[PDB]
């Protein structure tokens, strides 16, 4: 671990300094020491505020929403310091944390951060109110190049299949719950009851993680399979039977 | 009520009484009884479709 820390009361200038030091050390470890470094950054909204501080110090007129017009170049230079290189055994993976201002998707900071980076992950306030930790919303979540990050050889072959099944089933469960909330159980069929049970068990178990539960990919795949086994093969349509024989008849 | 909207339904009650139970006793009443059961099941069907 390499822990850099910068309290709030510290100088405004030093705030724009720490990420560069972290990036330099991460590059040194990943390339010169052939490591696989997962760097994480926190609260880039306040980093943008520090950028605003230096911009005010520069006597340059502010741009849209008061933020400087050259936020793009600085944030791009921060984000793009990663990847793998030829003739090297190592990689760098960046995961920043952006504090979405007051649920504003159109705010410039998150818009540009979505433009530069690849994919995004959302959290939910309602799930946090439901006391389900971590409050992660997978309905809008999207990983850009997951199709090559996973598959046979790297891991179990049918991981992507399983995630697609879980996503589709979650969507159907949410839709039937929405129809339910105004229509009524009098007009509800058994398969919809199974979908409701799967949804409830899904937020109860899969989304629920807890603080100190070291979970591995294989047992999570087993849990997903157990959830999918509530249904028979008839409506588990999206997966070829040649691969459903792998775990469905257990 | 289905889907929050109400509709009516009709049901048949068979009161235990009769008036023509023995019309035409001295000439014949079995064909009349066939008519009785035929028209009773007809009334069932008609009430259902109503």
Curated annotation (Swiss-Prot), chain A:
The record's statement on gene disruption is: Morpholino knockdown in the whole cochlea, especially in hair cells and spiral ganglion neurons causes a dose-dependent hearing loss.
Q: In which tissues is it expressed?
A: Kidney; found in early distal nephron, encompassing thick ascending limbs and distal convoluted tubules and in the alpha-intercalated cells of the cortical collecting ducts (at protein level). Expressed in epididymal clear cells (at protein level). Mainly expressed in the organ of Corti and spiral ganglion neurons, in both the early postnatal cochlea (P2) and the adult cochlea (P30).
Positions annotated to bind ATP: 144
Q: Which family does it belong to?
A: Belongs to the ATPase alpha/beta chains family.
Q: What does this protein do?
A: Non-catalytic subunit of the V1 complex of vacuolar(H+)-ATPase (V-ATPase), a multisubunit enzyme composed of a peripheral complex (V1) that hydrolyzes ATP and a membrane integral complex (V0) that translocates protons. V-ATPase is responsible for acidifying and maintaining the pH of intracellular compartments and in some cell types, is targeted to the plasma membrane, where it is responsible for acidifying the extracellular environment.
Describe the subunit structure: V-ATPase is a heteromultimeric enzyme made up of two complexes: the ATP-hydrolytic V1 complex and the proton translocation V0 complex. The V1 complex consists of three catalytic AB heterodimers that form a heterohexamer, three peripheral stalks each consisting of EG heterodimers, one central rotor including subunits D and F, and the regulatory subunits C and H. The proton translocation complex V0 consists of the proton transport subunit a, a ring of proteolipid subunits c9c'', rotary subunit d, subunits e and f, and the accessory subunits ATP6AP1/Ac45 and ATP6AP2/PRR.
Please report the name of this protein according to its UniProt entry. V-type proton ATPase subunit B, brain isoform
**Organism field:** Mus musculus
Tell me the part of the parent protein that is shown: 257 to 506 of 511
Swiss-Prot record, chain B:
The compartments listed are: Membrane; Cytoplasmic vesicle, Clathrin-coated vesicle membrane; Cytoplasm, Cytoskeleton, Microtubule organizing center, Centrosome; Cell projection, Cilium
Which superkingdom does the taxonomy of this entry point to? Eukaryota
Q: Which family does it belong to?
A: Belongs to the V-ATPase D subunit family.
Subunit structure, as described in the record = V-ATPase is a heteromultimeric enzyme made up of two complexes: the ATP-hydrolytic V1 complex and the proton translocation V0 complex. The V1 complex consists of three catalytic AB heterodimers that form a heterohexamer, three peripheral stalks each consisting of EG heterodimers, one central rotor including subunits D and F, and the regulatory subunits C and H. The proton translocation complex V0 consists of the proton transport subunit a, a ring of proteolipid subunits c9c'', rotary subunit d, subunits e and f, and the accessory subunits ATP6AP1/Ac45 and ATP6AP2/PRR. Interacts with SNX10.
Describe the function of this protein. Answer: Subunit of the V1 complex of vacuolar(H+)-ATPase (V-ATPase), a multisubunit enzyme composed of a peripheral complex (V1) that hydrolyzes ATP and a membrane integral complex (V0) that translocates protons. V-ATPase is responsible for acidifying and maintaining the pH of intracellular compartments and in some cell types, is targeted to the plasma membrane, where it is responsible for acidifying the extracellular environment. May play a role in cilium biogenesis through regulation of the transport and the localization of proteins to the cilium.
The name on file for this protein is V-type proton ATPase subunit D
């Amino acid at each position: 671990v390499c822990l850099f820390l910068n309290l709030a009361n510290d100088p405004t200038i030093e705030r724009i300094i720490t990420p560069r030091l972290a990036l330099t050390t991460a590059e040194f470890l990943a390339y010169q020491c052939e490591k696989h470094v997962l760097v994480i950054l926190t609260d880039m909204s306040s980093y943008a505020e520090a950028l605003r501080e230096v911009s005010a110090a520069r006597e340059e007129v502010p741009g849209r929403r008061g933020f400087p017009g050259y936020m793009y170049t600085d944030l791009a230079t921060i984000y793009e310091r990663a990847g793998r290189v030829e003739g090297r055994n190592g990689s760098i993976t960046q995961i920043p944390i952006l504090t979405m201002p007051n649920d504003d998707i159109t705010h410039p900071i998150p818009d540009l951060t979505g433009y530069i980076t690849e994919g995004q992950i959302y959290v939910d306030r309602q799930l946090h109110n439901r006391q389900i930790y971590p409050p992660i919303n997978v309905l809008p979540s999207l990983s850009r190049l997951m199709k090559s990050a996973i598959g046979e050889g790297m891991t179990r072959k049918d991981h992507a299949d399983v995630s697609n099944q879980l996503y589709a089933c979650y969507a159907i469960g949410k839709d039937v719950q929405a129809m339910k909330a105004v229509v009524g159980e009098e007009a509800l069929t058994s398969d919809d009851l199974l979908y409701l049970e799967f949804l409830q068990k899904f937020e109860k178990n899969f989304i629920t993680q807890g603080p100190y539960e070291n979970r591995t990919v294989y047992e999570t795949l087993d849990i997903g399979w157990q959830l999918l086994r509530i249904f028979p093969k008839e409506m588990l349509k999206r997966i070829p039977q040649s691969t459903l024989s792998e775990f469905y008849p257990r | 009520n289905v889907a929050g909207v109400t509709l009516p339904v009709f049901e048949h009650y068979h009161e235990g009484t009769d008036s023509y139970e023995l019309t035409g006793l001295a000439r014949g009443g079995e064909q009349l009884a066939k008519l009785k059961r035929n028209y009773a099941k007809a009334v069932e069907l008609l009430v259902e479709l109503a």
